Amino acid sequence: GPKTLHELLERIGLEEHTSTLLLNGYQTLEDFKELRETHLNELNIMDPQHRAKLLTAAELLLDYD
Amino acid sequence: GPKTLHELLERIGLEEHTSTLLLNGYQTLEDFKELRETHLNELNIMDPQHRAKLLTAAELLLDYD
């Protein structure tokens, strides 16, 4: 599957948040596995669609590595 | 990661759609990889949140097997 945070984001079409995530501790897929909702609140990532895609991706990333 | 369609759905919290999906050709994770939006339209799965979770999961399932 996608090998970089950027590649992951591109795949679910949310590369617009790449620069946000990396400036606040989300640089690798390994970091991205640790994402949860209140961080999205803090990052002002408030679109419920974006948020559902992001958290679903993180959960499945943790599950299937 | 989750090994059954039902386990996957449970994980992203959408087990309510299990019975829908299986009655229309989505019985395994292998089948679920083939999901796309217009099938959700046909299955009257119209919540945009549910739909984003479902399709994100399917895309990532295809990508990381």
Numbering used by the authors:
A (entry chain A), B (entry chain A): 253 to 317
From the paper:
The multifunctional adaptor protein SLy1 (SH3 domain-containing protein expressed in lymphocytes 1), also known as SASH3 (SAM and SH3 domain containing protein 3), is exclusively expressed in lymphocytes and plays different roles in various lymphocyte subsets. SLy1 is 380 amino acids in length and contains a bipartite nuclear localization signal (NLS), a Src homology 3 (SH3) and a sterile alpha motif (SAM) domain, which makes SLy1 a prototypical adaptor protein. In the current report, we show that the SAM domain of SLy1 self-associates to form a distinct dimer with an affinity much stronger than reported previously for homodimerization of other SAM domains. Structure determination reveals that this SAM domain forms a novel type of dimer interface that is incompatible with homooligomerization.
The first variant is referred to as SAMwt and contains the SAM domain (P254–Y316), the five residues D317-E321 succeeding it in SLy1, and an N-terminal glycine from the tag. In parallel, we determined the crystal structure of SAMwt to a resolution of 2.05 Å. The structure belongs to the tetragonal space group P 41 21 2 with one molecule in the asymmetric unit. The final structure comprised 65 of the expected 69 residues (P254–D317 plus the N-terminal glycine). No electron density was visible for T318–E321 in the weighted 2Fo-Fc map, most likely because of conformational flexibility at the termini. The 3D-structure adopts the typical five helix bundle of a SAM domain with the following secondary structure elements: α1 (L257–R263), α3 (L281–F284), α4 (E289–E294) and α5 (P300–Y316). In addition, a composite helix c2 (E267–L274) was identified consisting of a 310-helix (E267–H269) and an α-helical segment (T270–L274). The highest dissociation free energy was obtained for a crystallographic dimer with 2-fold crystallographic symmetry in which helices α5 and α5′ point in the same direction and are located in close proximity to each other. A free energy gain of 4.7 kcal mol−1 and a buried surface area of ~870 Å2 upon SAMwt symmetric dimer formation were obtained. Hydrogen bonds and salt bridges between amino acids in helices α1 and α5′ and between P300 and Q301 at the N-terminus of helices α5 and α5′, respectively, stabilize the dimer interface.
